[PDB]
Amino acid sequence: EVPLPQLRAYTVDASWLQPMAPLQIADHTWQIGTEDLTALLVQTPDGAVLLDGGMPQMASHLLDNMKARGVTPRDLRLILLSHAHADHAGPVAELKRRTGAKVAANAESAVLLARGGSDDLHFGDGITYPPANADRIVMDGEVITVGGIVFTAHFMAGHTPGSTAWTWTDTRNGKPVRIAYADSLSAPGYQLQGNPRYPHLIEDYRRSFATVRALPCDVLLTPHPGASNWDYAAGARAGAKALTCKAYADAAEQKFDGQLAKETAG
Ligand SMILES: O=C(O)CNC(=O)[C@H](CS)NC(=O)OCc1ccccc1
Ligand SMILES: [Zn+2]
Ligand SMILES: [Zn+2]
C-alpha cells in the first residue's frame, strides 16, 4: 500500500522571505518587500500604489512597511502586477481584504490571478495561491495616474501571457528619473518549442526582448532583483550595479537562445 503523495508547498530560498526596511529608490518610490523579492511602494499626495507584493505570507510585512512610510490601509489605492505568479502576486487577495486597494491588470494577468495561478501553462497546479479579482482591465500602452505619477503598461508576454513592464517618471535631486519595472524574461523549466498551450511562445519572447530594450529606462528594477543586478541588502550601493534595460534584454535573449539549443538537444 503506497498512498498518493502529499501536497507540496511552494518553498523558496530564505532570502526571498527575509524582511527588510523600506529602501528608497527615488523621491516617491520605495522597495518595501523582502531582500530577494521586489514590492514597490509609490507614495503621492493623492494616495499610494503597490507594484507586486511577493509571496502570500508577505502581506503583514508589506502593511508594516507601509505604516512606517505613513501609508495607512485606506491610503493604498492601487495594486499593479508584473505577472500573476505566486511569488509576485501571492498576497494580493489578502491585501485587497485589508486595505482600500483595487487591482488593475491586463486580461491575461486578471484571468490567471482569478485562478490563483492554477492551471499554469507550464507549472500546472504546482504554485497556486489565493485567487483575487481585478477591478480594472488595462490595454497595452494604457496609462493610469495616481497623484501625478503616470504609470504606463508595456505588454511583454512570454514568462506569462500577461507579463507587463510598468514605467513611470519620478525625481531624484529635482531631476527626472525614468523608472522601468520590467518583468521576468526567464523561462524556468518551460517547453519553448511546439508547446500546444503556447504556440507562439518563441515569437512573443523575441518581441518582449525588443520591448524591454526600448523602454524609457534611467533605472531598471525587476521582480527578482538579481535579474537586474540589484542587491537590496547592500544599502547605499543597493542599485549601484544595476543593469540597463538594454543589457537586461540582451542577457535574457542570450540565455533564451542557449535554452532553445539545450531543449533541441534534450
Ligand atoms: O526566478 C525565476 O525566474 C523563476 N522562479 C520561480 O520560483 C518561478 C516563479 S517566477 N516558479 C517556479 O519556478 O516554480 C516551479 C515549481 C515549483 C513547485 C511545483 C511545480 C513547479
Ligand atoms: Zn514567474
Ligand atoms: Zn518569480
Side-chain angles (χ1 to χ4, degrees):
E1 288 189 13
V2 179
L4 302 168
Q6 300 285 342
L7 299 172
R8 280 152 45 232
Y10 180 33
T11 58
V12 300
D13 289 351
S15 63
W16 293 28
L17 298 171
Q18 176 57 53
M20 61 178 288
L23 174 66
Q24 192 169 18
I25 309 302
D27 287 342
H28 307 259
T29 304
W30 297 75
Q31 153 64 8
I32 68 158
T34 50
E35 304 192 339
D36 259 335
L37 290 168
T38 299
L40 299 174
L41 184 71
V42 176
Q43 274 184 268
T44 81
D46 206 22
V49 182
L50 180 71
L51 301 94
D52 287 353
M55 288 280 288
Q57 63 269 57
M58 284 170 51
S60 285
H61 166 69
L62 299 167
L63 292 167
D64 288 343
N65 271 351
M66 284 177 236
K67 179 182 284 292
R69 293 267 74 251
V71 173
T72 73
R74 172 135 85 127
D75 287 329
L76 188 71
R77 291 177 60 193
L78 181 62
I79 292 168
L80 306 178
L81 300 169
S82 58
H83 69 277
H85 277 163
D87 58 331
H88 310 290
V92 166
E94 183 172 349
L95 291 170
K96 290 191 79 195
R97 293 196 307 274
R98 296 176 68 183
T99 75
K102 290 184 176 195
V103 171
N106 57 25
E108 288 284 2
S109 291
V111 159
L112 183 60
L113 184 71
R115 298 211 282 273
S118 71
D119 189 27
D120 186 88
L121 300 186
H122 308 283
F123 301 142
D125 295 338
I127 57 157
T128 56
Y129 59 96
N133 294 319
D135 301 285
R136 169 174 180 179
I137 300 295
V138 293
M139 289 292 281
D140 196 8
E142 186 166 0
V143 309
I144 298 174
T145 298
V146 180
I149 305 299
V150 180
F151 300 90
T152 296
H154 309 253
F155 292 6
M156 43 172 296
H159 182 82
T160 62
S163 284
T164 302
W166 285 102
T167 62
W168 61 106
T169 297
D170 200 339
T171 50
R172 188 155 164 165
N173 306 313
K175 297 270 74 215
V177 177
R178 296 166 295 175
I179 297 177
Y181 186 42
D183 199 20
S184 305
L185 284 167
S186 63
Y190 292 9
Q191 177 185 333
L192 307 176
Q193 294 181 275
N195 186 323
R197 292 294 296 279
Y198 201 159
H200 295 290
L201 180 153
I202 289 163
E203 300 159 66
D204 279 0
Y205 270 88
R206 299 223 183 267
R207 181 145 40 270
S208 292
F209 304 140
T211 288
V212 173
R213 173 177 165 92
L215 293 171
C217 186
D218 293 318
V219 176
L220 169 67
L221 300 152
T222 49
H224 294 277
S228 55
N229 278 185
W230 273 81
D231 181 2
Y232 294 148
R237 288 314 177 244
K241 310 177 172 164
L243 302 180
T244 61
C245 290
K246 270 175 99 191
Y248 173 50
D250 186 76
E253 181 156 62
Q254 292 307 115
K255 191 179 236 73
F256 188 88
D257 288 346
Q259 184 171 341
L260 282 166
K262 283 167 49 352
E263 184 173 305
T264 291

